[PDB]
Symmetry: C2
Subunit: 75 residues, 2 copies
Amino acid sequence: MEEAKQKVVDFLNSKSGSKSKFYFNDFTDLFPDMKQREVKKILTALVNDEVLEYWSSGSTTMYGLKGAGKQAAAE
Amino acid sequence: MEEAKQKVVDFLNSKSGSKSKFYFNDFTDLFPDMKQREVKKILTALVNDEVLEYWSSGSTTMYGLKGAGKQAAA
């Protein structure tokens, strides 16, 4: 995986201070050096590859690692 | 995603499914027409792609969707 994508996965794959999904703007907050359009492109490629799952949320979007939604529902 | 890989992801991406630990032979049980080595290569590709994570467990190996280990722990 390329470094920018690996940094998304590593943030999400954390025990402490984490949850099943984060806003688009949580990722731009974490990678302020990147263009926001490029953050959207890398997140979308990770959803297409099924590393991430995608959600609509209100007026924006959320992302988490594949399976996190069902795992949290299970509880 | 190729069909066998998608079958593994869909099997794991479920509520029932997230409550459980699945070992290598549980996946080979789902692919009776395949050699164990072919299933190991499918699962290893999914680990490389970081769709799955895996580790050694007991006498075998355990596979889950990426992040499952640390979600559950939290």
